[PDB]
Ligand binder design. Structure first.
Ligand SMILES: O=c1[nH]c(=O)n([C@@H]2O[C@H](COP(=O)(O)O)[C@@H](O)[C@H]2O)cc1F
Ligand SMILES: O=c1[nH]c(=O)n([C@@H]2O[C@H](COP(=O)(O)O)[C@@H](O)[C@H]2O)cc1F
Ligand SMILES: [Cl-]
Ligand SMILES: [Cl-]
Lengths: 213, 213
């Protein structure tokens, strides 16, 4: 990923989303698009980003349904042009495998979300996170998502998945995570509000990159 | 809910989804629409269902993001016309409260998903389900979702939420759940494939209703 920086584009109207992404297009080649934008503007927005910016698109949908429905969601998402999709690991192995099947069939990628970055993640997710990570490793998952807000947890996740696995991490900036510290373990950081809500998105992105040069 | 029957409309194209729902419109007044249909046809499909069938719409999105993003998803979903939204409880209390805030503001409902119906749910969700249910009760949540595939678990969920709470349950039909048995604890059953994939959807719906007269 260019500059180890993935833009989380969660603005909810096409004009703003496209304008801000355009402002920082020179600093990134990977954008994470989620439900805030997709539900507001439609899935066609994914193709718009790919054509306008030539960027990789990660659908941050965090699929968490039964196997059959997960397959349908992945199919629809990849048909829309997404290069990868984020999947929740908490629902179990069968739900993850359903996504892996579609990804292999269509030549796309699955990112396994192991532990989340918000406070509430401590209640139920954290206690299952290490096992979720091991589940991914046992199934051959190569891409993971871990929390920037809990450095020691992110470090443990890295130990479980190994050096060869790709790890991205949200929670940088607005949620309190530090770019440099997070990159001690993750290969790339996900940054949303710190950039898209900044008075000068380009300056914000450049500042983050400067701090991790 | 009419006939204690909620149609899970997971077909992925407008014509088929509307045609099948029309075939069974006399048997239901509540439809659960999820990502398979919404991502394929756009969120405007919710308003289409409401105007064509005059039915209640439950968005089976099972929101499972951080508080800030959950708020955005709920806002977009309710703006689209959904009467209620299903929210995953595993991400914690703050993520649930974010949804409750928007629902209260817009005069809509939140359904808390405790335990899931598929096999993989046993890995991590099941062990946290009773506590997730208690979390909902402590926050004043009145609508819940529990598994038809595990009758004793559904029974335990009912005991935790009390007789006053509203409980709906998926996993009936295709996943093996029995309509009558499930209704010993749930107030309404969610049925998808057993109806929408049937040779005669109307006959399938009528048959289910007949078995629970
Ligand atoms: O654990 C997680 N934490 C997150 O913050 N996210 C997403 O990353 C993004 C974080 O953006 P921020 O604005 O930089 O906080 C946003 O899209 C979230 O929904 C997902 C996760 F899986
Ligand atoms: O635990 C769950 N099990 C489910 O099956 N579902 C949804 O209910 C529906 C079940 O449909 P079926 O075709 O009757 O199995 C479908 O939309 C699922 O995504 C959600 C859940 F939260
Ligand atoms: Cl995400
Ligand atoms: Cl659902």
């Amino acid at each position: 990923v260019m500059n180890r920086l993935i833009l989380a584009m969660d603005l909810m109207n096409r004009d703003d989303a496209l304008r801000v992404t355009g402002e920082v297009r020179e600093y990134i080649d990977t954008v994470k698009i989620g439900y805030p934008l997709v539900l507001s503007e439609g899935m066609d927005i994914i193709a718009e980003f790919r054509k306008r910016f030539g960027c990789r698109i990660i659908a941050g949908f965090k699929v968490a349904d039964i196997p059959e429905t997960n397959e349908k969601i992945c199919r629809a998402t990849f048909k829309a042009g997404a290069d990868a999709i984020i999947v929740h690991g908490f629902p179990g192995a069968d739900s993850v495998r359903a996504c892996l099947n579609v990804a292999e069939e269509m030549g796309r990628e699955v990112f396994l979300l192991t532990e989340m970055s918000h406070p509430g993640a401590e209640m139920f997710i954290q206690g299952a996170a290490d096992e979720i990570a091991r589940m991914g490793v046992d199934l051959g998952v190569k891409n993971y998502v871990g929390p920037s807000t809990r450095p020691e947890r992110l470090s443990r996740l890295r130990e479980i998945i190994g050096q060869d696995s790709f790890l991205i991490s949200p929670g940088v900036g607005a949620q309190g995570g530090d770019p440099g510290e997070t990159l001690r373990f993750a290969d790339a950081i996900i940054v949303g509000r710190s950039i898209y809500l900044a008075d000068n998105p380009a300056a914000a992105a450049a500042g983050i990159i400067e701090s991790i040069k």
